[PDB]
């Protein structure tokens, strides 16, 4: 009945997708020169944790970064010195996410209790203290990013996203159109709109203000394990678990490059473009990271510093460093 | 060779490091236990005998040990996602129906067997011993493969043999027991299994595989 009409509409939408694919970015830029072997030396080793670290986020200063572990700690590192500014003892050790406000006075992390805590750093008493506890979700919380000093965003394991309101502790909006579990999201350079992954090999482009998905790209194969916007907020290269990173076009509405290499068969676990939008970094389950060429797809220098799988990595705001975190419980600030 | 304030920051870093070390030391002296099992099959009984919408952590103790039993049963997502979080758990308690030889809910007994087979081959748990609690025995006293003797004490033995033979590794031993103990003997079985697991784990650190 209506399912047949939906399939017919999908046929039309895929036909439209194909009708505007004169180029591929592969034949173009063929004459463009490559980038020499990118060699990066482990500059600093931040070694404080005692167990696997599952997430981290770079502060706005490009100097302070926060990481979380199953040990039940949030240590606010200092990159230029390797010091520990703060150590926040968590309530539920099962933590699988972190954030950092554009201002330096808020940090949030909630992994498996279905609630994300909001912490206060710039407090008169001098001790970091919990500020709220958002408990509307019905599944394990995957990723959560601050939008402003208030209005956090979240995506949980029950196929929903929230866009909370910190002052009232209420779900102002609720995004729900996903068929399966949601595994990660990312905010655009401007906070106008964001995207989310899924476990059904699909991605959706939400709208922050009014709740409805605007576009759905289904060029992927197995899963989604990481998303991140390309600078200028138009591509948002996507992770994977089929060993094939991809980057779609928000305006052309179709997958574009599909980076891949035969030798590697592992699940990607994180991705984050570089400052100039030329490099595409990707942490792999194969115990070592990699650096791609965003415009030619050729591989580049390997980052074989770590021991166990890489879980999280992020380029700074100014692009002066690249931090990675593996289940070895060591953060390495490359450069 | 540092300024007036930087040395204070270094002192703060040292204090934080010492506090982290102290917290870590007193956290490896307790025993973890992941509690899996087919739903609606003798789980609440074990939990109750032992002593929000997610991980429920029971925190009992028994004879100088400090058990922390993470009863994960709330998540409705596929287990492939949050299972790896428990890769360093000293054991995986398991509860089966033992009453599914007749009901079909496919018989729950076969479903529990398949789940146990899946949990016994996961790459994460290829080294963690497993405990079986064949609970709901009083009511227990199809599945027609051989069952020749057909008696209670032979059907139970056959099912236990199936479960124990579902494993195929040499460095993980599967224990067994039946519940409905007069006292809190179920914890006693868990205590014995934990002691044996720790002994066998410390005997592999000095060679002597």
């Amino acid at each position, epitope marked *: 009945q209506l399912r047949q009409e939906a399939e017919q509409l999908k046929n039309q939408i895929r036909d439209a997708r194909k009708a505007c694919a004169d180029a591929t970015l592969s034949q173009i830029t063929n004459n463009i020169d490559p980038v020499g072997r990118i060699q990066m030396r482990t500059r600093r080793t931040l070694r404080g944790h005692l167990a696997k670290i599952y997430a981290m986020h770079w502060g706005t200063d490009s*100097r*302070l970064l926060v990481s979380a572990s199953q040990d039940g700690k949030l240590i606010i590192w*200092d990159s230029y*010195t390797t*010091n520990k*500014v*703060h150590a926040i003892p968590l309530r539920s050790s099962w933590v699988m996410t972190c954030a950092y406000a554009p201002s*330096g006075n808020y940090v949030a992390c909630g992994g498996l209790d279905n609630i994300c805590s909001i912490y206060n750093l*710039k407090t*008169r*008493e*001098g*001790n970091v203290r919990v500020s709220r506890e958002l408990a509307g979700h019905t599944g394990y919380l995957s990723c959560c990013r601050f939008l402003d000093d208030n209005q956090i965003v979240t995506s949980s394991g029950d196929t929903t996203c929230a866009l909370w309101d910190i002052e009232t502790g209420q779900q102002t909006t609720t995004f729900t159109g996903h068929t399966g579990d949601v595994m990660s999201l990312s905010l655009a350079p401007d906070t106008r709109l964001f995207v989310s992954g899924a476990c059904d090999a699909s991605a959706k482009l939400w709208d922050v203000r009014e709740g409805m998905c605007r576009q759905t790209f289904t060029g992927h194969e197995s899963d989604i394990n990481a998303i991140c916007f390309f600078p200028n907020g138009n591509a948002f290269a996507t992770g994977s678990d089929d060993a094939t990173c991809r980057l779609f076009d928000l305006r052309a509405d179709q997958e574009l490059m599909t980076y891949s290499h035969d030798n590697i068969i592992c699940g990607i676990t994180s991705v984050s473009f570089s400052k100039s939008g030329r490099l595409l970094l990707a942490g792999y389950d194969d115990f070592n990271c990699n650096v791609w060429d965003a415009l030619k797809a050729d591989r580049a220098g390997v980052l074989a510093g770590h021991d166990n799988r890489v879980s999280c990595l992020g380029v700074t705001d100014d692009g002066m460093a690249v931090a990675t975190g593996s289940w070895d419980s060591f953060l390495k600030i490359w450069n | 060779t540092l*300024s*007036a*304030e*930087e*040395r*204070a*920051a270094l*002192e*703060r870093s040292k*204090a934080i490091e010492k506090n982290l070390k102290e917290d870590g030391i007193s956290a490896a002296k307790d025993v973890k236990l992941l509690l899996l099992g087919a739903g609606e099959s003798g789980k609440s009984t074990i939990v109750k005998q032992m002593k929000t919408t997610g991980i429920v952590e029971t925190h009992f103790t028994f004879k100088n040990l400090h058990f922390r039993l993470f009863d994960v049963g709330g998540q409705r997502s596929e287990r492939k996602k949050w299972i790896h979080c428990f890769e360093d758990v000293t054991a995986i308690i398991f509860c089966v129906a033992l009453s599914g030889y007749d009901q079909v809910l496919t018989n729950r007994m076969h479903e529990s067997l398949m789940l146990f087979d899946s949990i016994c081959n996961n790459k994460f748990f290829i080294d963690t011993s497993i405990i079986l609690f064949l609970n709901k025995k009083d009511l227990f006293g199809c599945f027609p493969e051989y069952t020749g003797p057909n008696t209670y004490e032979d059907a139970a033995a056959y099912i236990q043999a199936q479960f124990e033979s579902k494993n195929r590794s040499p460095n993980k031993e599967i224990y067994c027991h039946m519940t409905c103990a007069t006292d809190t003997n179920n914890i006693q079985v868990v205590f014995d299994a934990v002691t044996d697991i720790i002994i066998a784990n410390n005997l592999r650190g000095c060679g002597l595989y």
Partner: single-chain antibody
Amino acid sequence: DVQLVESGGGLVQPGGSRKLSCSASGFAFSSFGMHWVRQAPEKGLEWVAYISSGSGTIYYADTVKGRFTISRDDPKNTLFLQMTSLRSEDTAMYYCVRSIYYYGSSPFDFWGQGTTLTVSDIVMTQATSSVPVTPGESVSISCRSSKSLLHSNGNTYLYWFLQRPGQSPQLLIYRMSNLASGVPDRFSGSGSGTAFTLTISRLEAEDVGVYYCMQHLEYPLTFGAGTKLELK
């Protein structure tokens, strides 16, 4: 609310001994660095002692070295100071402050009250102590050092403090470029690697106190001469 109060203020004779103390209740006192600062009937405002978070660092002022002892116990949130060989030069009212040192922190936040008692280094000067002024305009203070105050870390440790008449002072500007929370935006700070100055625009009926400037590049923090502002 945050408050620090003193315990022992009394009349003592030269050649005895007396012990000071304060009580803190509003914050997590167990992880703070507490200073001691003295004064005088004159504008004189000088450094006294110090104690760090873990009690592993204790500095002093050479003028009282070997006579003044400092110590505190975290569980009671109480600081103790012991004095001996009390000369008439010691007569002054002793303040007590707090300071927490980490990247991005503001030392010397909350200045408490003080007790009344009776009986090379860096040098800074503040010329033109007296400065007539009227409301509806800006002003400019300045204190100068004798050694470059710009450290290689990129920071320039220099603080400012305002003291209202009959009242303990409060932090005004730290590192000559940052404002302590709650201070209105009229105040501002700047300076080169050797010279420093403020710009207090739109003077109101409240900015009437005296100003001092601290140097923290070397731990014997030594303040500058007072620069009072009347309302001629």
